[PDB]
Amino acid sequence: MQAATVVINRRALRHNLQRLRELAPASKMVAVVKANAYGHGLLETARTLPDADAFGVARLEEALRLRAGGITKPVLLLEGFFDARDLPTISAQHFHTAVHNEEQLAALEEASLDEPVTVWMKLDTGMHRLGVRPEQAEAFYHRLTQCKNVRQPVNIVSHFARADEPKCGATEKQLAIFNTFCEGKPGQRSIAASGGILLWPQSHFDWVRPGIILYGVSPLPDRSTGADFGCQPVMSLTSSLIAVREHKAGEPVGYGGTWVSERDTRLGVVAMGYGDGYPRAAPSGTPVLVNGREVPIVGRVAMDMICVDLGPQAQDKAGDPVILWGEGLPVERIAEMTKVSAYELITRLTSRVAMKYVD
Amino acid sequence: MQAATVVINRRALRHNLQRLRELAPASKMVAVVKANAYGHGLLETARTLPDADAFGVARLEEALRLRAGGITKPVLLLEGFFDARDLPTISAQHFHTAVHNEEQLAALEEASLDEPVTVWMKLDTGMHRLGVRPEQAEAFYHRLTQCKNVRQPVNIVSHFARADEPKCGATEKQLAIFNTFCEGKPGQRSIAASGGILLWPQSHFDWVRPGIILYGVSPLPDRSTGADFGCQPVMSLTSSLIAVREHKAGEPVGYGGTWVSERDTRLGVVAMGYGDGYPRAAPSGTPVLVNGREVPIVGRVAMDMICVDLGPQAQDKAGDPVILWGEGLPVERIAEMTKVSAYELITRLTSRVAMKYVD
Numbered sequence: 001m002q003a004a005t006v007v008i009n010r011r012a013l014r015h016n017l018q019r020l021r022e023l024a025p026a027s028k029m030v031a032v033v034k035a036n037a038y039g040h041g042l043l044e045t046a047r048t049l050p051d052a053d054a055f056g057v058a059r060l061e062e063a064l065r066l067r068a069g070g071i072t073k074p075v076l077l078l079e080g081f082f083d084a085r086d087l088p089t090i091s092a093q094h095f096h097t098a099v100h101n102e103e104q105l106a107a108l109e110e111a112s113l114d115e116p117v118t119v120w121m122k123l124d125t126g127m128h129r130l131g132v133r134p135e136q137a138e139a140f141y142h143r144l145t146q147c148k149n150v151r152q153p154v155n156i157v158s159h160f161a162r163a164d165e166p167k168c169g170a171t172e173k174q175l176a177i178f179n180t181f182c183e184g185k186p187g188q189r190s191i192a193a194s195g196g197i198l199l200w201p202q203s204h205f206d207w208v209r210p211g212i213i214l215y216g217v218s219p220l221p222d223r224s225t226g227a228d229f230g231c232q233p234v235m236s237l238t239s240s241l242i243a244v245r246e247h248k249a250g251e252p253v254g255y256g257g258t259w260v261s262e263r264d265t266r267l268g269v270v271a272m273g274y275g276d277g278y279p280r281a282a283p284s285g286t287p288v289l290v291n292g293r294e295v296p297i298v299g300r301v302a303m304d305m306i307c308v309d310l311g312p313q314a315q316d317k318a319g320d321p322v323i324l325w326g327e328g329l330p331v332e333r334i335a336e337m338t339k340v341s342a343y344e345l346i347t348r349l350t351s352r353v354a355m356k357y358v359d
Numbered sequence: 360m361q362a363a364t365v366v367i368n369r370r371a372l373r374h375n376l377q378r379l380r381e382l383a384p385a386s387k388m389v390a391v392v393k394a395n396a397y398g399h400g401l402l403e404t405a406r407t408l409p410d411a412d413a414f415g416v417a418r419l420e421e422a423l424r425l426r427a428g429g430i431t432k433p434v435l436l437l438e439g440f441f442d443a444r445d446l447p448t449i450s451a452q453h454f455h456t457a458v459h460n461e462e463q464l465a466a467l468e469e470a471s472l473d474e475p476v477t478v479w480m481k482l483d484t485g486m487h488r489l490g491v492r493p494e495q496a497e498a499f500y501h502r503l504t505q506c507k508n509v510r511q512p513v514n515i516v517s518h519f520a521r522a523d524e525p526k527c528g529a530t531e532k533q534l535a536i537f538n539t540f541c542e543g544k545p546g547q548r549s550i551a552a553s554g555g556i557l558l559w560p561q562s563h564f565d566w567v568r569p570g571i572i573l574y575g576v577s578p579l580p581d582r583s584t585g586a587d588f589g590c591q592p593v594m595s596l597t598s599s600l601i602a603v604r605e606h607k608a609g610e611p612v613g614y615g616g617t618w619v620s621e622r623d624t625r626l627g628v629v630a631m632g633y634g635d636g637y638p639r640a641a642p643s644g645t646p647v648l649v650n651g652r653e654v655p656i657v658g659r660v661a662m663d664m665i666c667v668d669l670g671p672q673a674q675d676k677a678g679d680p681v682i683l684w685g686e687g688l689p690v691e692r693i694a695e696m697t698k699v700s701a702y703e704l705i706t707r708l709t710s711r712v713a714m715k716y717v718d
């Protein structure tokens with residue numbers, strides 16, 4: 001039988017990269033593949049997009065894992081390097097890096113490399129997470145153009161904190177700061193991720209960094225799905241029923257007796273739980289497809305199982321196909337119902353989930 | 360590594376198995392290691408406990424993975440087998456199985472195996488998740504004693520739905536039903552997991568199945584910890600700071616501008632996010648240890664990073680040790696602050712977290 005499985009549509013992945021090129025026609029693409037390509041799988045997602053101009057990762061470990069799998073294209077270390085002793089590898093592996101601190105800068109200044117490295121100075125334009133603040137940036141920037149170990153020109157990168165909230169002036173302010181600092185400087189500019197790409201065409205510049213929407217999922221907090229932008233969903237979280245049992249009115253289900261039935265019915269048990277990555281927070285009523293028909297989750301989600309209400313004469317049987325989200329049921333619909341971010345839903349899955357690739 | 364890492368204390372693990380033998384002195388132990396041993400590591404956790412009477416898993420795949428690693432004790436398939444074509448492997452691998460449906464029973468009835476298999480009839484005593492209902496149990500049970508494919512005697516297993524709620528009578532009702540069915544029967548009895556073991560000594564019977572408490576974490580939802588029962592915490596979710604930046608009063612942090620500072624201060628950025636398994640639901644103020652000193656999380660938890668408030672003048676720096684939960688900080692405290700179950704915190708982690716084993 002088949003249990004917890006993530007089916008990845010390679011065809012939809014391809015379609016989305018091309019669709020994003022159409023929406024951002026004058027910008028190169030940094031396919032962001034951090035966290036195991038967003039739960040889709042880091043090396044397979046890269047191999048599915050040999051057309052990507054570059055790949056973005058959070059950590060050096062992820063980039064090296066790409067190189068190990070035979071990925072040859074430029075990989076961008078979005079958070080830079082955490083140890084100065086890593087520069088020689090970064091240089092030799094032809095990894096491009098962000099530089100946000102003095103550790104990183106002072107290291108590049110005194111390292112001894114056999115080749116210089118391509119760098120993207122991270123500028124803090126409002127997110128206040130990583131990056132050099134405006135009033136320290138000019139001096140920091142100038143030191144990078146003097147590094148014999150940095151390939152010139154120095155590129156400039158930044159990130160939006162609230163691009164999915166078009167009504168507040170957060171984005172327009174970050175853009176204002178970004179634009180002021182880049183005036184008169186050569187080198188590529190990049191500040192847009194999924195939100196900036198879809199809602200802010202002024203922020204496309206030279207390179208855009210699609211992450212979530214690359215997988216056909218909307219980065220927005222409203223009811224929108226990847227299909228709202230012509231992007232197709234890549235992931236399908238699937239499983240199977242391991243039991244179909246009789247149940248009676250007044251009887252509770254699961255831990256804590258969270259749900260009590262008002263009628264005699266039949267309950268289905270799914271080989272899926274939070275030990276696989278399915279949200280334990282999922283409330284009774286959350287939709288799940290059984291034999292391509294939507295049924296509600298009843299009772300608390302356990303570590304390995306989920307119960308659903310099928311109906312008194314429901315003819316579903318142990319072994320039948322279940323879809324937690326995918327074709328027929330967008331992950332955005334599960335996010336709305338469970339109140340869990342689609343970003344976390346597709347990404348916080350465990351190694352217990354099998355991986356399938358189609359097309 | 361210096362980033363996302365889970366450190367597993369093998370010596371605390373052994374201490375807990377024997378501490379549990381002291382709490383349930385007349386019962387054998389079924390070490391429950393399903394879902395990658397609750398995030399601690401399926402095969403390493405088994406190898407650390409060669410003293411366990413048996414190992415419990417959710418799925419067949421997990422049991423096979425144990426045999427592949429050289430684990431030889433008896434392994435109990437807590438949910439049984441999902442396909443009749445699996446009986447031959449299960450018989451040959453000497454896996455013990457639960458039997459809750461007719462598909463499983465009919466499979467045993469007509470299979471041809473070189474050896475009979477040890478079975479635990481799963482009885483639904485109130486949880487209404489898996490198991491044969493009371494009114495169908497006697498006939499179902501009798502068919503199992505007539506199998507030459509089943510090693511006699513037929514053992515009886517069940518599970519509590521609310522053992523962590525001593526004030527509702529649910530547990531005494533399940534126990535009442537369990538006891539009535541076992542009257543006059545010749546096999547082993549088992550109904551207690553972590554809660555039943557600690558709060559209900561009349562449910563210990565022949566075998567107890569410690570899961571969460573085996574890892575030194577309390578099953579109950581009140582604020583007690585594993586140390587309340589003499590059990591030592593096995594897991595430590597650790598990482599490092601990748602940046603220490605200046606921040607000013609009135610300035611927000613992270614996505615959505617969730618947190619705004621009322622002083623000038625210094626922010627630390629941790630190489631930890633929900634792409635690793637850390638709850639994106641963690642509210643500002645949640646505790647983190649930086650250099651063995653507690654600091655609050657400020658702003659939204661991102662996929663790869665977490666910001667903390669260090670103070671205006673604070674001497675922490677990129678590279679310094681961070682503890683998300685562990686030595687200075689029980690996962691139960693993080694569960695309270697996060698309102699996320701300790702079961703899910705330690706279990707729903709991703710494959711990007713490195714694994715260390717000490718002692």
Ligand SMILES: *Cc1c(COP(=O)(O)O)cnc(C)c1O
Nearest residue numbers: 032078159193194209210211212
């Ligand atoms: C992860 C990340 C991205 C992608 O963002 P999405 O909203 O998922 O598209 C792009 N850039 C940086 C700096 C990131 O850390």
Ligand SMILES: *Cc1c(COP(=O)(O)O)cnc(C)c1O
Nearest residue numbers: 391437518552553568569570571
């Ligand atoms: C997983 C499980 C356990 C162990 O539960 P804990 O609450 O962690 O003690 C024991 N028995 C069964 C039937 C289970 O599914």
